[PDB]
From a paper:
We have recently identified a periplasmic protein AztD in Paracoccus denitrificans, which is able to transfer zinc to the cluster A-I SBP AztC23. Here, we describe crystal structures of AztD homologs from P. denitrificans (PdAztD) and Citrobacter koseri (CkAztD), a pathogen of the carbapenem-resistant Enterobacteriacea group.
Poorly occupied sites also exhibited weak 2Fo–Fc density for ligand residues, indicative of disorder when zinc is absent. Indeed, although the crystal structures of apo and holo CkAztD are very similar overall (RMSD = 0.22–0.44 Å), residues 99–104, including zinc ligands His101 and His104, could not be modeled in three of four chains of the apo structure. The C terminus including His405 was disordered in all chains.
Author numbering: 33 to 98, 105 to 344, 350 to 404
Amino acid sequence: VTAWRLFIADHDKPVVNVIDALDGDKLATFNVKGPANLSRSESGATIFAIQGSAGVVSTIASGIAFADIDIDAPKLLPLELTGKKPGHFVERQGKIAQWFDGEDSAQILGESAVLKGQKNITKVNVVAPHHGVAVPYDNYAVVSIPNPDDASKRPVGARVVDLQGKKVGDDALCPGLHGSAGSGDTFALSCETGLLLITQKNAAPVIRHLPYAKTLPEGSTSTLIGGKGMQYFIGNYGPDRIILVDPTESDSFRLIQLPTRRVHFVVDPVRAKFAYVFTEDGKLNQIDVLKGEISQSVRVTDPYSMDPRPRIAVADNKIYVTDPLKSKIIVLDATSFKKTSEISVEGQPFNIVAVGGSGKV
């Protein structure tokens, strides 16, 4: 049995739609408190709907878990996280860290408990409310350090804390810290001088700094995605360029110039040599990460000359591009890179995540 599902948040309405990615039919629509940004767990078993303006994070059991596969209907869980302006969500190996821009704490919990209907939260102090990020580790977390002076500015680095908020090592200064992603056993935080790279073995997590290569043009990264199946990061580097970073090689950086400005990007979790960038001209661009170049482009929507704009997700052998102003999802074959289908979604379909796979029953 093969099963994949899309989870789509409306830009304005407090709704999340669940769509069977394979035939387009609707599986559920969930009503939440506010418009949501969506994240999935690594296992794909839970979906989190972050509602910045409503002070809540809702949780969805996706209904697909695992090889052997167990398939149920998707369901809104009664577990909700509460706090002012929920922010960056980071999940790793079933450990969850939910940041709150308006709180003195981040909330750490575990996927296994969430799915069982349990809410077992550890609040870790982050010194001062700010727009930051928490990465969960075994018996530790990495949390951004709020800007001294103001604190409403971007954070100035990160540090290891134990789960009582106590600092462990020394601070890792990274001015203008913004942007985070995991790829394999390595987690990256971007800032004005480069990337913080985080790994954990059997002790405290270890942070090291990778400066932007001296050969790059002036610029820095403020958003990151992480490869799945091959270890790398993709960041923005100015509005019309991206950088590919290999954190395991000394020749770390490759710059790609886009023809027009970036709207969104995602990696391909199935064909790990590829990633995808959507640009304001309305094209989907295939990034061959090994060669460091755009290998092809295809027009998918009308231009969105830089509020809602398309978002990409990948499921099985298909790519899904939300077209909010046209109340639909465009579906392309990943291999041929051609449109094959469209799926209607009422309203302004915006953020999108996909889960699934295959297993015996």
